[PDB]
Design a protein around this ligand. Structure first.
Ligand SMILES: Oc1ccc(F)cc1
Ligand SMILES: Oc1ccc(F)cc1
Ligand SMILES: [Fe+3]
Ligand SMILES: [Fe+3]
Ligand SMILES: [Fe+3]
Ligand SMILES: [Fe+3]
Lengths: 166, 510, 388, 388, 510
């Protein structure tokens, strides 16, 4: 009852089985990613099982989306009815209009938490990934070491709990 | 009607023209650089000639292995410690070779010139070969060795221990996750040019010294393929040297690449070499200095200067933290021996003399500790003592760097002892150096790797081992051991009866 | 010196004595089988499986993984090293796949090396035997140096189409097959050039430059539609499986198999050309080799997945339709090639019999596997509608 | 036991030290080149030469031998183990010959092994690609099964013609080449059977029994004179050089080249047969490989011998005239096979041109080397008389 | 439309039919026997498949030699005495293998059944493989060993000495000169089955014991080919058992073949094994007794009894003469050491105990002789002494058997002490046994081999050595030596000093 098989993981296999609606499932996944993934997650209570759980949901969402959408849609329409190409072009715009890395990083991460497959089709997702990621790095790696650690910590907004250097 | 044919070079002359321009003819991966579409590769090879030169090599290699080496029982007449060392060296290097497959694939996708794509392609295939070669070593030692456990299931038993996490960083994720160029620097510009290429030769040296003729037969064969990977890492810089983004980003990804790789290998390689053997070849300090400073940081990087490449700014810092790094790490490795998939041994008398001789001060620190542990019975199953206990008793916390995954103990270390702890959105993070701390502060979403204490928190030791199959065939005896002798092997029960439960060391700051 | 200054532990008396004294009476574990935990696809575990299965360090959150936790380092943004997010297909295990030919690096390069060395021997025999004499000057300088050559850029394009898969593949067994499927494709492209290069050495005025065959590929009308299908399969698809499936279970299975077999393999002989068929023999041997891997992956494993069988078929049927149309187009534009042939070469009766072979084979080996109910007559009709 | 019972001097501490102690400080001679005393054919001595030359224990009384004295045991009657009396040809040194391909056993079986494994790969790909479908049934059942099939006996007979030379060759280099020329011939006969056996597996009703091909060979008209020539070359010639020379520099160079190249290789393609050409490629590669050895031995070494050049050319000229007639006869009867083809397959002009190709290649590659005066139109005219 | 192919046995099923009938379809060689026209072979092979299985063996063999063995310096780490022994063992077997090439070509000619021909054909190619394999061992030792001289030119330096002559009898002329069947008995039914197969394995044992891993690598590979040669020799007996002539001549030819082989290998192999090695494996006597008596005279001969095969009538004498033969011969080989292409050594103290222990009486006879020679300074270049002289002073003439070529000293030998001297048509002939004598009396024209004494008569020793290139690359030092140490090597002039002239011992008789 720990690493690969545990009570908590079981709890979610049942919770996902009750999902029989592309709408609901797609919603839950979206919320789940907002609740447990990335450094901006709502909490870390599921840290040890979230990656596995999230996948089991992508699974339910995939199976449904397929039995719900149609040829043309499954390839260009998100699980939220949104038009992939549209969203992609939209996020890339915001990103290329980003004033700084702090703003850019928020766009990219946010993009992933919302449109990660089975939400957005893979083809558009990874293409966005290639463009968004490129922007993020360009701003971040510019004069990477100029900001001293002391100031950088304040910028990140981290709570320093301990430091020691002889 | 004279007998005529056509060679690789004659067909390769037209390879560059194989690609053609058009709208979406561009890389699918995020990068800050622009690789020139007129870049050329050094070796004019075609698929068929590549297969031939590799096949000829396989013939020699496997012939030696299946014939003369088996007849000589080369799989057995190897020192126990080294048989164990090769479980890690071969399998850990295998994952490196394996992710190198995806890396050069990603690199192949990045390059636009047909020749540059062809270069990476040759490596994609080479890395597959190296994956199988490393696999064959463990397979051979499992089939004919003095202790198959570990060699036979490292692919899953390596997941129990903490040293494996750091390996995936430098030879897995470091190879494929991030800007294609950054991954190239970690793989070919730093990892391969500074560590892998020199390492592989070193390994055959230590191997030979300890009776191991198997690894030399395979690794030297792997070595013959490296002159191509070097050319690839070199052509990576040449293809972006004209792009303006280069002068603005290159040395940053490189410094981060250098620190990343050295952070792991400096302590890990020296440890495997000096503590995983009986007969010594050369002190790790002398080796490191030659590799990192002279060979790489001096001659190699110097030739790339004309392309705007400078010595990593973290160089002097690395040399500072290096001296005792491997010695500091083995204490943690041995203290946590039940989490490995190999058997460790404590320095014998001749070895302690060797250590003190080459590392003045070694005995008064590491030596005394090892003798204390041994006298207390760390080797004997009936003692009820595992060195981790000693760390708890003397309040010496062991942490895992959130970035490099390298274990470190600031209160006991003789080398670096800096420690930075932070909290962000409900999660604590421990860092062992300023470079890693910066990497995390700047790219928080790139480093969310859970550490062993976090995942094993609250779990009793023997329960984690049994779940992850840290057992030998009899279903009771542990794969890992605190000695390398044939008698008095520790069993799962010997561990259960101790009631060791994992704790997250960071919570002490709460 | 004669002995060397370096002492080796296996042969040095002093060192070996120390080694032997430390050895245990017997092996510390009787299980000397590496990969003993792998589920065999056959009677007993094969060398191919031992050396390959689980080499990829995936954690359990990626179907089949045995490791735990997140990756140590990721992409700026948070993108994982390998993830479920790179392909529409889902499965209970990405390590179920097995190459029926069981090819790990060693066997692979061994086989290709033999082909290379024999190829050289053959070429030296062909040139010495003057077999070139019975070769039609037109076919040589036109259909081979222009239309055959141009087909190399086709294979080359399908080669590159594998690049992303080589990076994104979710398992060792699938990554190795993919890599071999693409490596074989570029081999063929180089073989096409090899011949054009050989012809150059024996034919006084034959020009080996790719200038002609390229322009024909980039501007010609024969391949135009085919070149567009390639570009898309390569640079417009970001899903490694979609790319592998579509390229092998659709495009190359139809257009490719036709251009190679039904056209050059079935006509070159008629012009006193056994040279080209020598190479096509290789390309077809490769095709049938890759086919078995493709079948096992998308049908035996994915299509028949104990949990996502219906789901995957839906996606593959979808992908089939998606690319079946551009494939038909590639063919149509290719049909406009018989027109450049001298009269009497072949009639619509044959051209039809061949097309039906390709389509029938395609339906028999691929289409019917995922239940992609298709119409042979309609298809052939649409393609055939491209003749003079 | 894990270590075993037998102790080895290389790894056993006690025994190795005993050995190491008895070793000199350096080699007792710095000349580490075995065969150093052999006169190199090329720039440097080759591994092929070192491992082969002078392996045959000839005494100086057999041109070029380094030993001395009679043989230890001879045949009843007195015949020597090896001797000058077994061939009409004379030379200053029987060891001058060099296989231009420098084939000693290892390279030889290596190349043949590659061809074998690739052949297997080729057939499996051929059957899997279903190419057999477009092959003309008549060509398949009549010309491949019966006529191509009967030819195996021709190759088999030529293989057997080498049996005495394998025993009587006056040097290692010649013995090795001769053995390889004959082994390649039996390989071809077996590849003809292999093809028939393969067809029986993918063609319902195809009988792989040799009964039909054999009856064609032993009692048919088409190969009547061919068989008479082969029976003669094999069992009526006791001179190992007359045998090898006449087989390769007369009969096989004219008749064999015509049958393999100007008939089957030339026409199989016209009937949708890409299968037979695959095996003929091997046969033709082998032919060109042997030709190099044959030319070196008979022209470069014997025909141009500094002391016996005139003598040897006179003798070989004699042999060419002796075997040119039966060879013309064999070609003449073979002409009968053209009447059996479907109307429109080929015509008198194509057939004549193909004959001139074989005759012209022979004159340039063989006849002219010994100043044999051959009249191409006279030879072709005599053969054409066989056209029904 | 399923993937299909055809294997070797599928084509072989129709091979027997490849041959056809015609008036002159008959063997070109004289023979008293008629091989059955419907005879079949044991292994269903075709050229392609034969090549493949041999090519696989070559990969392993050459792979081991070129890589691991070369890295281990296996060419050097061999006892000096054994390095010398392999000069003779490998080159002499090379000729056996070579003549076996022509021998089987002749059997292939004799056989009328396509299958029986094909069986022999496979050996023809095997024998070529073996010639090249044996040549490779000398090639390897010359390139990487402690003493290349002899290894690098045995094909011409072997002609200087008397031991070579007997070799060409049993492994050269005895293989191809005579009735095809007689030749087959010498080669396969006796040669290989009784001596070669057990010999090859025995040689690999003595090799390993003396540090040589080169020979085991090659010879053990040669051994895997001997299965087919055993079937050939066996099918020869079967292909003629139904012929009336077989009952009249089979046993006569078998008895002669038996004696021919035994007469030479009994003393020479034992000599090479016991005197050409440091580490002993087993006393030659028991090895012989097992091979000739059990494994062959009983086991192998009993199986062929069903075809009319009986047990050699000379087997009794062969055993009675066996016991000391090799000891008798080494005295001669050492006494005539200047005529070889290898270096010889006197038995050391440890060895004399071994010899005496396993052959009581060895010391009072041979032991004392060697001790005297040592005292006379036989190992020292300035002693002006060569054991031959000792034979002169003590009136112990050395004769050469006109038939077997085996040197013998009847007045000193502990084995056969018989001597028969005849005069026929102006020539003298010396025989050493009643079987060789019968052979010559009945077949004078088959045995006219001139011996070394006959050819060298009146010649000064050093002139013969110089004429036949018996020198090392310095052009002065002798290839042959009376000791295996690295210093004080006899030179051509040291032989000249001595002014020794050859004389034909038979000229004394009136
Ligand atoms: O032999 C070994 C194995 C692991 C390690 F960390 C040190 C030495
Ligand atoms: O080492 C040797 C070489 C030849 C011989 F006859 C005895 C021993
Ligand atoms: Fe590598
Ligand atoms: Fe590499
Ligand atoms: Fe043999
Ligand atoms: Fe044999």
């Amino acid at each position: 009852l720990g690493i690969h098989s545990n009570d908590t993981r079981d709890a979610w296999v049942n919770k996902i089985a009750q999902l029989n609606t592309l709408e609901k499932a797609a919603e839950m996944l979206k919320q789940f990613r907002m609740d447990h993934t990335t450094p901006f997650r709502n909490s870390y209570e599921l840290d040890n099982d979230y990656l596995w759980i999230e996948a089991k949901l992508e699974e339910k969402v995939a199976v449904l989306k397929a039995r719900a959408f149609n040829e043309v849609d499954f390839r260009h329409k998100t699980a939220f009815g949104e038009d992939a190409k549209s969203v992609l072009d939209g996020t890339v715009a915001k990103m290329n209009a980003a004033k700084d890395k702090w703003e850019a990083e928020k766009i990219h991460i946010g993009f992933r938490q919302a449109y990660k497959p089975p939400i957005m089709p893979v083809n558009y997702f990874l293409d966005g990934e290639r463009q968004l990621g490129t922007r993020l790095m360009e701003l971040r790696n510019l004069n990477y070491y100029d900001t001293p650690l002391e100031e950088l910590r304040k910028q990140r907004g981290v709570r320093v709990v301990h430091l020691q250097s002889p | 009607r004279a007998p005529t044919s056509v060679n690789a070079q004659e067909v390769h002359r037209w390879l560059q023209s194989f690609n053609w321009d058009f709208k979406n003819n561009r890389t699918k991966y995020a990068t800050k650089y622009k690789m020139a579409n007129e870049t050329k590769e050094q070796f004019k090879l075609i698929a068929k000639e590549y297969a031939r030169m590799e096949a000829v090599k396989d013939e020699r290699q496997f012939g030696s292995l299946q014939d003369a080496l088996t007849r000589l029982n080369a799989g057995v007449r190897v020192h126990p410690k080294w048989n164990e060392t090769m479980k890690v060296v071969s399998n850990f290097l295998e994952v490196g070779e394996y992710n190198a497959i995806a890396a050069t694939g990603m690199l192949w996708d990045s390059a636009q010139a047909a020749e540059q794509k062809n270069g990476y392609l040759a490596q994609v295939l080479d890395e597959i070969r190296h994956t199988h070669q490393c696999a064959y070593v463990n397979y051979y030692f499992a089939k004919n060795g003095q202790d198959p456990a570990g060699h036979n299931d490292a692919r899953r038993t390596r997941t129990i221990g903490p040293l494996w996490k750091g390996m995936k960083r430098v030879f897995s994720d470091g190879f494929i996750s991030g800007d294609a160029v950054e991954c190239s620097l970690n793989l070919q510009l730093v990892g391969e040019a500074c560590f892998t290429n020199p390492l592989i030769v070193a390994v055959t040296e230590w191997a030979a010294a300890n009776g191991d003729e198997i690894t030399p037969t395979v690794f030297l064969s792997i070595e013959t393929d490296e002159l191509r990977h070097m050319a690839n890492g070199y052509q990576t810089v040449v293809s972006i040297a004209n792009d303006p983004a280069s002068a603005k980003y290159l040395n940053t990804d490189l410094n981060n690449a250098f620190w990343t790789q050295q952070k792991y290998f400096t302590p890990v390689l020296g440890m495997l070499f000096e503590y995983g053997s009986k007969f010594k070849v050369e002190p790790w300090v002398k080796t490191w200095d030659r590799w990192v400073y002279e060979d790489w940081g001096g001659i190699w990087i110097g030739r790339l200067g004309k392309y705007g490449v400078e010595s990593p700014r973290s160089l002097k810092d690395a040399k500072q933290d290096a001296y005792w790094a491997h010695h500091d790490l083995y204490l943690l490795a041995y203290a946590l021996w039940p989490t490995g998939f190999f058997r460790l041994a404590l320095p014998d008398q001749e070895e302690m003399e060797w250590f003190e001789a080459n590392y003045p001060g070694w005995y008064d620190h590491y030596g005394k500790i090892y003798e204390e542990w041994r006298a207390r019975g760390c080797e004997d199953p009936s003692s009820g003592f595992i060195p981790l206990m000693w760390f708890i008793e003397n309040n010496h916390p062991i942490y895992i760097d959130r970035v490099s995954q390298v274990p470190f103990c600031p209160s006991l270390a003789k080398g670096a002892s800096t420690l930075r702890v932070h909290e962000y959105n409900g999660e604590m993070h421990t860092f062992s150096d300023q470079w890693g701390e910066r990497m995390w502060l700047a790219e928080p979403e790139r480093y969310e790797c859970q550490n062993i204490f976090e995942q094993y928190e609250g779990r009793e030791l023997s329960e984690v081992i049994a779940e992850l199959h840290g057992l030998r065939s009899d279903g009771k005896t542990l794969i890992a051991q605190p000695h390398v002798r044939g008698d008095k092997l520790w069993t799962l029960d010997d561990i259960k009866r101790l009631n060791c439960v994992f704790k997250n060391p960071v919570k002490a700051f709460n | 010196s004669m002995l060397g200054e370096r002492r080796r532990g296996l042969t040095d008396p002093e060192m070996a004595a120390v080694i032997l004294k430390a050895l245990p009476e017997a092996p510390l574990d009787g299980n000397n089988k590496m990969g003993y935990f792998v589920t065999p696809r056959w009677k007993r575990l094969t060398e191919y499986e031992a050396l390959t299965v689980y080499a990829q360090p995936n954690a359990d959150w990626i179907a089949g993984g045995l490791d735990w936790g997140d990756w140590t380092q990721k992409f700026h943004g948070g993108r994982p090293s390998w993830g479920n997010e790179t392909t529409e297909l889902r499965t209970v295990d990405w390590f179920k796949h097995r190459d029926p030919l069981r090819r790990w690096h060693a066997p692979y390069v061994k086989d290709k090396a033999e082909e290379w060395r024999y190829t050289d021997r053959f070429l030296q025999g062909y040139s010495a035997d003057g077999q070139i004499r019975a070769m039609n000057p037109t076919w040589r300088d036109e259909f081979i140096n222009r239309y055959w050559g141009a087909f190399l850029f086709n294979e080359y394009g399908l080669f590159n189409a594998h690049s992303q898969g080589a990076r994104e593949a979710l398992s060792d067994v699938t990554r190795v097959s993919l890599a071999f499927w693409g490596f074989d494709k570029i081999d063929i492209a180089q073989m096409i050039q090899l011949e054009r290069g050989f012809l150059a050495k024996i034919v006084p005025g034959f020009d080996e430059s790719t200038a002609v065959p390229k322009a024909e590929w980039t501007n010609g009308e024969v391949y135009k539609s085919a070149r567009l299908a390639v570009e898309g399969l390569w640079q417009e698809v970001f899903d490694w499986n979609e790319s592998a499936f579509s390229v092998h279970a659709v495009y190359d299975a139809l257009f490719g198999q036709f251009v190679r077999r039904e056209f050059f393999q079935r006509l070159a002989p008629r012009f006193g050309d056994n040279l080209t068929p020598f190479f096509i023999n290789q390309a077809q041997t490769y095709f049938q080799i890759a086919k078995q891997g493709v079948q096992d992956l998308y049908y035996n494993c994915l299509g028949d997945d104990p949990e996502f069988s219906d789901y995957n078929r839906t996606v593959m049927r979808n992908w089939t339709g998606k690319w079946l149309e551009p494939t038909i187009a590639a063919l149509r534009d290719f049909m406009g090639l018989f027109a450049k042939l001298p009269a009497g070469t072949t009639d619509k009766e044959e051209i039809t019999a061949s097309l039906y072979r390709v389509v029938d084979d395609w339906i028999e080996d691929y289409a019917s596997r995922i239940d992609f109910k298709a119409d042979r007559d309609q298809i052939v009709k649409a393609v055939l509608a491209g003749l003079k």
